């Protein structure tokens, strides 16, 4: 109804097929940290606030909310008639239950730190085993009023609440079934869809959740998510007419021709994302700053963005995208403005000083998730690091399936890993928070108490300028330590069939909510 322009002739079936790119780790939002996982979670569950086709915030499970003028108390007014898919009522108790479970050490959640980022009273103490989960600073004031108590001002709090990690869970179900609640037979959610089927490595089928509070505005009746790893295979299925929307990678070598032949089907979203090679800071020899610096100097970003990809990705030398809100004072480092000849000279010296030569080069593997585009970037990186250092680096490639790749990065079983970080919310700390010493997201094992202190100063600021200065200083410190190898800021290219509507190409987080889409007839 409302999302559909008047007069628009809708197709009768309303089925859509989307490539989700990989088999998700889990459908439990406390056990996951990836885009494939969040894409599934967002169809089955809905948090306090959610977003439209352009990423603008809109009421979710909460119909209204407010904050105290100090930005420390956040009150959410929940819908009195909203239900779980089994008929249970959705209440503030479910949010209290879910947010406690997220920080509870027993959950071992990859995103435990998220409530620490939000500065929720006692979140960090709970993660650290010093306080019980019941001591977390959130409460059901009554069944339909959920209150969040932050120890520091967090003016961007509402945007943080759209993240998968803060989705509610059906307390009554999870308390009874444990971790097994996530099985298809048991899953209960408050989102627009429910799980109709799941075949590992093949497909996830979604069906309408008729008990969704806003089911009357949902148009798509059913959807399939595929798990096609390689952009070229994604495009081949699309052109065979067997899927309707690709994942957010397209083959660089096909890109020009696809724009020519598929007019109005090629979308490119400019997103708040950074593609990096993460260095394992606690594994020899990347514990050596001199070697981390050599790798940064000797990698020519323009080769990757202009010659390997060429889809609008832009080179970067910092973790935070500088165009994110409050990111504007972050500076690209000085070396980024030196000619490659100078950079390569400096890198070779550093590597010789560290005992490498053509006969005894620095050897390591780039770990990446199986994907032909990542392979291309890794080959170009391998090739550049060898030639630019005159044979002093010799790089192997190792691809793993998504789930294995995530496990390997979290377990520290890597030298150098391909890493993409997409904003959890449209403000700088979604990047800055990543490299805090104690962040559950910090798989790099980067730890500088001076980085942590610079970030901490942001909460003492009283305005966006004060915050932006603190974030600039944090990034400067991360830059001087060469903690990682930033490569580019993302663009998200997709093919979308012309009968698919409600995909904007303008959402800086490029979410796809099935409830935002519709299939037209003509």
């Amino acid at each position: 109804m409302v999302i559909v322009p008047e007069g628009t002739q809708l197709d009768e079936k309303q089925h859509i097929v989307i490539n989700n790119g990989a088999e998700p780790q889990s459908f439990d939002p406390h056990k996951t940290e990836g885009v494939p996982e969040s894409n599934v979670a967002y169809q089955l569950l809905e948090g306090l606030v959610t977003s439209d086709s352009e990423g603008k915030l809109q009421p979710g499970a909460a119909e209204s909310w407010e904050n105290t003028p100090d930005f420390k108390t956040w009150t959410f007014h929940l819908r009195k008639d909203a239900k779980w898919s089994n008929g249970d009522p959705v209440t503030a108790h479910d949010f209290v239950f879910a947010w406690r479970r997220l920080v509870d050490p027993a959950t071992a959640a990859p995103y435990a730190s998220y409530l620490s980022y939000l500065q929720v009273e006692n979140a960090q103490d709970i993660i650290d085993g010093k306080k019980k989960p019941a001591e977390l600073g959130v409460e059901a004031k009554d069944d339909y009023t959920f209150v969040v108590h932050a120890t520091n001002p967090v003016p961007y709090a509402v945007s943080l609440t759209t993240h998968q990690s803060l989705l509610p869970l059906p307390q009554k179900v999870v308390e009874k079934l444990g971790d097994a609640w996530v099985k298809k037979e048991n899953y209960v959610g408050n989102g627009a869809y429910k799980l109709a089927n799941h075949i590992i490595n093949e497909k996830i089928e979604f069906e309408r959740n008729p008990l969704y509070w806003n089911d009357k505005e949902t148009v798509i009746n059913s959807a399939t998510f595929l798990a096609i790893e390689n952009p070229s295979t994604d495009v081949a299925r699309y052109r065979a007419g067997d899927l309707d929307m690709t994942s957010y990678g397209l083959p660089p070598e096909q890109f020009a021709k696809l724009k020519k032949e598929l007019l109005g089907e090629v979308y490119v979203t400019r997103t708040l994302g950074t593609y990096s090679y993460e260095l394992n800071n606690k594994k020899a020899p990347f514990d050596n700053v001199n070697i981390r610096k050599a790798l940064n100097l000797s990698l020519d970003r323009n080769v990757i963005t202009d010659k390997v990809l060429g889809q609008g990705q832009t080179p970067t030398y910092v973790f935070t995208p500088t165009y994110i809100e409050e990111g504007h004072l972050i500076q690209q480092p000085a070396y980024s403005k030196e000619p490659m000849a100078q950079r390569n000279e400096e890198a070779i010296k550093l590597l010789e000083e560290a005992g490498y030569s053509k006969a005894n080069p620095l050897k390591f593997s780039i770990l990446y998730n199986t994907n032909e585009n990542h392979k291309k970037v890794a080959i170009a990186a391998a090739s550049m690091w060898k030639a630019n250092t005159k044979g002093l680096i010799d790089v192997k490639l190792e691809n793993q399936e998504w789930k294995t790749y995530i496990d390997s990065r979290r377990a520290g079983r890597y030298d150098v890993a391909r890493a993409g970080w997409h904003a959890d919310y449209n403000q700088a700390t979604t990047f800055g928070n990543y490299f805090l010493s104690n962040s559950s997201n910090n798989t790099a094992k980067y730890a500088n108490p001076e980085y942590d202190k610079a970030m901490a100063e942001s909460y003492a600021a009283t305005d966006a300028e004060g915050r932006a200065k603190a974030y600039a200083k944090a990034e400067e410190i991360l830059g001087k330590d060469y903690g990682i190898v930033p490569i580019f800021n993302y663009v998200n290219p997709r093919l979308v069939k012309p009968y698919v509507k409600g995909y904007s190409g303008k959402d800086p987080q490029d979410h796809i909510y099935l409830r935002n889409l519709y299939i037209i007839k003509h």
Partner: peptide, 6 residues
């Protein structure tokens, strides 16, 4: 969020 693609 960790990104699958690029």
């Amino acid at each position: 969020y960790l990104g699958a693609n690029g």
